[PDB]
Structure 1
């Protein structure tokens, strides 16, 4: 039992975070970690070796950008976990991860090992009350308000088309290609 679940869309390009009932995601930031390349010589300089979201957008020239997730597959989990730690920081949402349940939206036809490792982080590191993983395609139709329909979702990481009948995705007709916005 909890107050209000937090929806977190794990997009390849930008992470969209907000509470269930909200019309728009209140907190949207790019899904990459920026580390300062240049050496600190003077005191009272920018503190920290990690910059995420608007702090990395303002001082972009200083930072080296590394994306932890490519084609919806997390290559570096240390960076991905730190970004989910930033989701609960004072900048975005500013709430306790143990207090609110989480809804994550993963790409279709992903490996099972990703969902298994993703689940471990939010139950071990963040001690979340409850976790629900959802498909990108099924949610897109719920928003539009159609139970049956083909979702041609061309994302930053991957492009895929899922034919869905009465809210059920046909696992044999799903077609995904690595070519995307990036």
Structure 2
């Protein structure tokens, strides 16, 4: 049973899906489960009472949105099962789970219990013929067409700098933080309350994400922007009322570089990138500096790459050629790589078959990934 395999690229913020050997993921939607706050009085209302994807985006105000996955670690397993069922259902894929092999993705260095429980869901609840979990950085390099280079990424949950050199993903040199787009959105929400405009509701939380996506920019010199007084630019909400954003827009994405502002000890994106290069061998450092690939949604801030280049110039040894490259479609970089990896004839060897899982168990899944 070697049908066209499916590539479900997981993520805390957004979840991508579709078939192998494709240019773009056809099925992209945000990873959450909306449920109705209000009392459904009238007959002929929205049926089901568990909303995922575009229906939930259309009907935000009704639904109490909650995310199942934080920092690449699922909290609510029943919610992720409903999301995966919605992916396979007629509203999105129009396929059965029994036909196609599965390509899953996860952030590196996660708890193994969650990886085991993920496999249990795919093999038992769904009747998958073969499963395969993989890295995000390895796929992003397959999407670009390079083998050597570091992959800095920044989704909604995790930020991790994975160094790879000619098909050798060093498991030891992988740096990681639990600081990312969701924490930046939460930090921007806190700043908007300091400005004046309070947002506490779960449906109203996605307006803060929309403001973060649209009206934000990362300054090169933060001390210079602190001394100067801001212009206070405007933005229209979904309702109609205008909001002067003020200094919150530029101080919000500083969290990624300065993790002390939220109140939690971490390295930072720029430190993690330097740190992933340093932990590798001495001969391979200069090739890793030359090939730095960006990925994820939280790398799309204005003057983000320029700030990363300046931070590398400050920390790294002098007289070294720095190059932070990036693809055009930074959001769909990991999925394209999975679609390429799935289309290859080698893919049959790597996967965990259902028969092999039934015989061995979790140990076979731990062996095949690394």
TM-score (norm 2): 0.48
- Secondary structure in 1 aligned to 2:146? coil
Deviations 1:61-116 (A, max 9, x none): 00000100000001000101110000111111110001111000110001111111
Aligned residue in 1 for 2:215: none
- Secondary structure in 2 aligned to 1:28? strand
Distance 2:158 2:55 in 1: 27
Query: Is the helix fraction higher in 1 or 2?
Result: 2
Report the Cα offset of residue 44 of structure 1.
Answer: 0.9
Distance 1:141 1:48 in 2: 40
Report the Cα offset of residue 137 of structure 1.
Answer: 0.6
Distance 1:159 1:140 in 2: 14
- Secondary structure in 1 aligned to 2:61? helix
Deviations 1:116-145 (A, max 9, x none): 100000110111010010100110101111
Report the Cα offset of residue 179 of structure 1.
Answer: 1.1
Distance 1:64 1:156 in 2: 19
Report the Cα offset of residue 5 of structure 1.
Answer: 0.1
Q: Structure 1 unaligned runs (5+)?
A: none
Aligned residue in 2 for 1:58: 58
Distance 1:2 1:38 in 2: 46
Task: Report the aligned-residue RMSD.
Answer: 0.8
Query: What does 1:14-93 align with in structure 2 at a 5 Å threshold?
Result: 14-93=14-93
Report the Cα offset of residue 13 of structure 1.
Answer: 0.9
Distance 1:168 1:41 in 2: 59
Distance 1:94 1:63 in 2: 26
Distance 1:28 1:89 in 2: 14
Query: Is the strand fraction higher in 1 or 2?
Result: 1
Report the Cα offset of residue 177 of structure 1.
Answer: 1.0
Report the Cα offset of residue 175 of structure 1.
Answer: 0.8
Report the Cα offset of residue 2 of structure 1.
Answer: 2.5
Report the Cα offset of residue 171 of structure 1.
Answer: 1.6
Distance 1:76 1:171 in 2: 28
- Secondary structure in 1 aligned to 2:162? strand
Distance 2:64 2:22 in 1: 34
* Structure possessing the higher relative contact order (Cα contacts under 8 Å, 6 or more residues apart): 2
Distance 2:97 2:34 in 1: 24
Report the Cα offset of residue 154 of structure 1.
Answer: 1.2
Report the Cα offset of residue 23 of structure 1.
Answer: 0.7
Tell me how many residue pairs correspond in the alignment.
Answer: 180
Aligned residue in 2 for 1:100: 100
Report the Cα offset of residue 22 of structure 1.
Answer: 1.0
Distance 1:136 1:169 in 2: 11
TM-score (norm 1): 0.97
Deviations 1:159-178 (A, max 9, x none): 01011111221122111111
- Secondary structure in 1 aligned to 2:113? helix
Structure with greater Cα Rg = 2
